[PDB]
């Protein structure tokens, strides 16, 4: 699958990210199971990307698009979308299905 978008909290539903723009996040990542292996709040500091230039996850890029200023959501984001067959050694295993609850702060 891709990347399937459940809102949390609804944002303006207006505003959404277009290509070349800074996306402001806070974000907690987490495995299948729950275990969290990332999170930018607990580093107290939002998380920037450039929408489009694939410095994020291919479910990211597709993901945050869907969603508008100020909206907190979770994106499921299935390992074709993800860290594939590969993963991330000892943080995201092989064909690993992941949870991110997002919340899109502002656009720069």
């Known amino acids: 699958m891709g990347v399937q978008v459940e809102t949390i909290s609804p944002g303006d539903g207006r505003t959404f990210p277009k290509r070349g723009q800074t996306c402001v996040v806070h974000y907690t990542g987490m495995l299948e199971d729950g275990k969290k292996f990332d999170s930018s709040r607990d580093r107290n500091k939002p998380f920037k990307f450039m929408l489009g230039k694939q410095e994020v996850i291919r479910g990211w890029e597709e993901g945050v698009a869907q969603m508008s200023v100020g909206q907190r959501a979770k994106l499921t984001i299935s390992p074709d979308y993800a860290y ?25």
């Not at 067959?85 to 991110?100: D, E, K, R, S």
């Open 84 to 108: 594939g067959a590969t993963g991330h050694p000892g943080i995201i295993p092989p064909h690993a299905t992941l949870v991110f609850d997002v919340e899109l702060l502002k656009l720069e």
